[PDB]
């Protein structure tokens, strides 16, 4: 019949409890320990410069108003009891759209302790903005952060720390990004000062390295094949005006179509990407190849042999310079 | 044991408090000071003529009903206490879809003061409509505004002012638009009169200058290269009927594809954009080039030399006129 005794204890704790007042109101700030259990990173969008993160956000703090005696157990209460308890106003500064799962009930956990320690866990799917430097794209490396901060309480009223040191954030190995690999993650604790006051800040950052395997097949290889295709016109006899002209035109038109497709999948950034430089270089070679026959046709009404060695050599030299610069 | 004393003070303030009545009801209007801390501008959509804005909206006003004595501190209460307090009915007139973040709790701040001053902060992501003049697109300059107004209370009951003068709105430097640059921002205070009455209005406007770097590579450069490509037919001998005809056709077809792609990314405006004028001009040159050979073929069954100098000169003249007019 301990359930009645437990019910009396819980009702005693909530009798006179004021959710409007933080623990130790008017006194020392309350320290809040935070751990993150990463579930997965669903998407990493370059166009929107944001990523989708699902995680188990857990907060640890002590409230002496909830301390109970005589029960040597950790009371795991229903998630609906959190509405009658004070919780930190933790929010994500760089998020764009976030929500808490509510099937079959709200993904929320409350676990009291005899000494007054309160455990508060939430399963949150968040979309956090991440500015990306696409100058070295697609060979770029990105650093996406997750800013954690209190909204109303300043450093004089609340403090944030990573519970467990560098082991606070787990589940990093669970991240399976087809396009990126988690090189490293860091935990940063700092205080950020605004006009209203100074607020505690916790930062979680991942360094992402893009995988080049997809882009070699999708973009680089088709561009090289078109450039090699234009070189076929050199071996064709000069009298075949229709064939050589058609070969030069089609390669140029195909190069434009490839260039248009790539830029549609990326945000309208003003600076030139690394992939754009390669496409521009490939366009130069095919354009020069068509101009090469125009010079041949003009003088005719040896040059082809000279072009048969310069173009493959120059293109090979261009590739060597391009890859070494960006690797 | 000041928490009990604070709890008694707060309960005393809310005892008999009527949220339905504004402060100083029936008397002088209550002045509300507003500051905006811009977080970021996520998107600027030309097709929908709107932009997405995330900001920290803070309201400052004094309510003598909430004045307390004996506590020389600023009471930072839980965000859930705002439901028992009167707040201004501030809304955005030109917004299309807005919401208040609620992870892990509602992004809301309440901070009372001993003299009755109340601080109310909200983190709001809003999508505000912004009509755009695309006549000079993509070399255009846009002026997007954010209208702030009370919904129910007229100027006789409430007044709005920018708290801090021109420093009310901060975080403008945080705006990182890949396609636009924040030239200037202005703060405007005015009274707008409707049938129901006159209402206070606060306006926040940004002047955006579009970056031309992306459009030069995406649209202008491919069009120029196609136009230069058509000029190659001039050096080709007239007897190569298949080659010269194919060169003229493919350039014309490619120009159409480029024109179609650009207009799909923009709203169906009736007036002609600056970029449309350039594409139409480029289409004229390539169309005339194909017509040039048709005249040559007709007379044959010198003209090419005269076309080799007129077309590059006319196109260069067209570019000089085009750029000077729009710069």
């Amino acid at each position: 019949g301990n359930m009645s005794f437990v019910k009396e204890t819980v009702d005693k704790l909530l009798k006179g409890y004021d959710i409007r007042l933080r623990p130790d109101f008017g006194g020392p700030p309350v320290c809040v320990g935070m751990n993150i259990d990463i579930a997965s990173i669903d998407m990493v969008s370059e166009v929107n410069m944001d990523y989708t993160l699902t995680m188990y956000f857990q907060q640890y703090w002590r409230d002496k108003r909830l301390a109970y005696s005589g029960i040597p157990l950790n009371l795991t209460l229903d998630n609906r009891v959190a509405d009658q308890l004070w919780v930190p106003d933790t929010y994500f500064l760089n998020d764009k759209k976030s929500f808490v799962h509510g099937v079959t009930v709200k993904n929320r956990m409350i676990r009291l302790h005899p000494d007054g320690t309160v455990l508060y866990g939430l399963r949150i799917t968040t979309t956090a903005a991440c500015m990306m430097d696409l100058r070295r794209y697609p060979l770029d490396e990105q650093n996406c952060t997750l800013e954690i901060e209190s909204y109303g309480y300043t450093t004089d009223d609340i403090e944030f720390y990573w519970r467990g040191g560098d082991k606070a954030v787990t589940g990093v190995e669970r991240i399976e990004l087809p396009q990126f690999s988690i090189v490293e993650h860091r935990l940063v604790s700092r205080n950020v000062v605004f006009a209203t006051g100074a607020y505690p800040r916790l930062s979680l950052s991942f360094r992402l390295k893009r995988n080049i395997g997809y882009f070699i097949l999708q973009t680089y290889m088709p561009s090289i094949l078109i450039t090699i295709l234009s070189w076929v016109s050199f071996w064709i006899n000069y009298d075949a005006s229709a064939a050589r002209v058609a070969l030069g035109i089609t390669t140029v038109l195909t190069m434009t179509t490839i260039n248009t497709h790539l830029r549609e999948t990326l945000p309208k950034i003003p600076y030139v990407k690394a992939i754009d430089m390669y496409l521009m270089g490939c366009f130069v070679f095919v354009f020069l190849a068509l101009l090469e026959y125009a010079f041949v046709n003009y003088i005719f009404f040896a040059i082809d042999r000279w072009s048969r060695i310069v173009f493959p050599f120059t293109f090979s030299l261009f590739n060597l310079v391009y890859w070494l610069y960006y690797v | 044991g000041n928490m009990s004393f604070v709890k008694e003070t707060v309960d005393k303030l809310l005892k008999g408090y009527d949220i339905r009545l504004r402060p100083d009801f029936g008397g002088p209007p209550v002045c509300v000071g507003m500051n905006i801390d811009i977080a970021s501008i996520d998107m600027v959509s030309e097709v929908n003529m709107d932009y997405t804005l995330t900001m920290y909206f803070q309201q400052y006003w004094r309510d003598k009903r909430l004045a307390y004595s004996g506590i020389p501190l600023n009471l930072t209460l839980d965000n859930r206490v705002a439901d028992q307090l009167w707040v201004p009915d501030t809304y955005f007139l030109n917004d299309k879809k807005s919401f208040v973040h609620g992870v892990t709790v509602k992004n809301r701040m309440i901070r009372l003061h001993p003299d009755g001053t109340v601080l109310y902060g909200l983190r709001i992501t809003t999508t505000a409509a912004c009509m755009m003049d695309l006549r000079r697109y993509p070399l255009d300059e846009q002026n997007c505004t954010l209208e702030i107004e009370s919904y129910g209370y007229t100027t006789d009951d409430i007044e709005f002012y920018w708290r801090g003068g021109d420093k009310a709105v901060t975080g403008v430097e945080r705006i990182e638009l890949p396609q636009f640059s924040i030239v200037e921002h202005r703060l405007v205070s005015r009274n707008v009169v409707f049938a129901t009455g006159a209402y206070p209005r606060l306006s926040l406007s940004f002047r955006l200058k579009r970056n031309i770097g992306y459009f030069i590579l995406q649209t202008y450069m491919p069009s120029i290269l196609i136009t230069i490509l058509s000029w190659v037919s001039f050096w080709i001998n007239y007897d190569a009927s298949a080659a010269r005809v194919a060169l003229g056709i493919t350039t014309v077809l490619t120009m159409t594809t480029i024109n179609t792609h650009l207009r799909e990314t923009l709203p169906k405006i009736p007036y002609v954009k600056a970029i449309d004028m350039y594409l139409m001009g480029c289409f004229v040159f390539v169309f005339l080039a194909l017509l040039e050979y048709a005249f040559v073929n007709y007379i044959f069954f010198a003209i090419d030399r005269w076309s080799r100098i007129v077309f590059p000169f006319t196109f260069s003249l067209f570019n000089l006129v085009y750029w000077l007019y729009y710069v």
Partner: nanobody
Amino acid sequence: QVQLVESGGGLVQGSLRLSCAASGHTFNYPIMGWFRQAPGKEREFVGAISWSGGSTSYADSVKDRFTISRDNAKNTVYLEMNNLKPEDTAVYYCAAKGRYSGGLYYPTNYDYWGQGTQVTV
């Protein structure tokens, strides 16, 4: 990791142009600020500017007198001090701020600082 070096101080009786060169992971720190610290007085915010967009802010004391501009080619942020006054006698520092590091006017929000240049009038 950003390294900041500033130069162009000296002593004058006038117009002076300070400069600050940055190197490293500049993308993570797109905001550059200028600070001065009078002897005994706390460090004072002068002006801030973003690497991209050229948006700038200034303090009331130095408003309409000091102009701040940067060139991304040299990764250099330069402060042009005109109509110098005896109040402008302090060590001028160059600082960089993170993307989500808060307000410009607070020096503690900046991570990397320069050694400092002495300007006396």
